[PDB]
Symmetry: C3
Subunit: 179 residues, 3 copies
């Protein structure tokens, strides 16, 4: 068995896990939830709920770096929020594939922080429904396929989880950045 | 990543999902549960519990068609029921393989309607036990392997789900049709 | 579909399932939990909690054999315990690979007895965290990858399960055997 390799979804994790961060409040410090680094500019999606009633927002990467974050705006209807941080050289960004089409049955990992936690499941249906366990911390976290490509943003029917389609999430983010 | 394909169980879904239907009661209309189209003749398995206290039974396919259903009979012990609908040309039937032998560890999708929901898991043991989440709607629904072949009929120990072996379910159906 | 083979993790099950046993108390007979046969000498790991308040310990293999077990010792901090049974010829032992490195994302089956139950999931994080459902019986049971190699010992955050790393578990066992 030492020769053979164990079936795993590790590749996807290495690709997307660095992009997913912990979100915090701020002396008093509390843990709010998860978030995702979209682009180099330093824009980060997260849930509207974590941001609310936050005086100071803090973000923590998997490599150890720690930033102060600015609230770019939110969207009540989809429970989303965007944040901004000063973009150093070589920020870890969540892999995105605008071309990929999410089909029902696709393997999906859910990444967040109910430390960092990776659950597995499939696309139950396409709002997006999945049976990868979604708790309080991994809300605002990522949801990617086996390739690692972003498929959705976890949010908050037992055993049933909800993610916002990445394309829709992408569009919402662009508008918030604008408006 | 755009070149590579994401691991998925979509093939199985396309093969078996059309066969799985929504079951209803009937002005008043209520949602009862799930069901499975066995053959062209128009016989459909479902749980005994959904059928009980139903004045009018209605069935809804994934292509949009909608029928009035007749209760062929039930079986108290296994909580099963069979239904009949007028068979149009080219009814979607659940793939069955009498030859296939269900082994423990086999990948299995659970199909039903706690809209339509697909959960994933494995055969925990062979009554048949699985860790694909089973709620109220997907009871009466299908349980198929990766190939799409029917493995069991979901029914109603947290995290633990129960399906009736397809062979046994097949035999029960034949008898009800007779008796 | 009869030609093609359904994706499954059965191979792993046949390799590791014989090694996992049921643990019992003893006229009065009660079911305590699960356990794992480490080596030919007849040493078996299990949780500290099942052993406590046990007057007589009994072990049951998947081939039908049944032994009286001796408590080699326990470890309060890690909730572990080791047991001894007279080693007949050709005891089923849990496959171990000291060389294998558990990566996050690895497919993992959890084996125990909330009869014998096999749940599936992945390594959520490395204490070891997994989303293979862990109940009361499968505590003290095994946790192996797809190859079948031992990865951890299940123990007792919904949807989140904990296993003790096999290497650490191995070291603890050696010390208990000594001390
Ligand atoms: Cl699961
Ligand atoms: Mg899951
Ligand atoms: Mg499941
Ligand atoms: Mg699971």
């Amino acid at each position: 068995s030492t020769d053979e390799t164990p079936a795993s979804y590790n590749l996807a994790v290495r690709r997307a896990a660095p992009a997913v961060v912990n979100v915090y409040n701020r002396l008093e410090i509390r843990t709010l939830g998860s978030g995702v680094i979209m682009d180099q500019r330093g824009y980060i999606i997260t849930n509207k709920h974590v941001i609310n009633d936050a005086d100071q927002i803090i973000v923590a990467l998997q490599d150890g770096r720690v930033f102060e974050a600015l609230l770019v705006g939110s969207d009540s209807l989809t429970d989303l929020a965007v944040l901004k941080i000063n973009a150093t050289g070589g920020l870890p960004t969540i892999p995105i594939n605008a071309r990929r089409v999410p089909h029902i049955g696709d393997v999906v990992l859910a990444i967040g922080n109910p430390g960092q936690t990776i659950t597995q499941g499939i696309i139950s249906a396409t709002f997006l429904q999945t049976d990868a366990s979604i708790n309080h911390g991994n809300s605002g976290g990522a949801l990617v396929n086996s390739l690692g490509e972003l498929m959705g943003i976890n949010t908050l029917p037992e055993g049933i989880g909800f993610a916002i389609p990445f394309q829709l999430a992408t569009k919402i983010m662009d508008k918030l950045i604008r408006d």
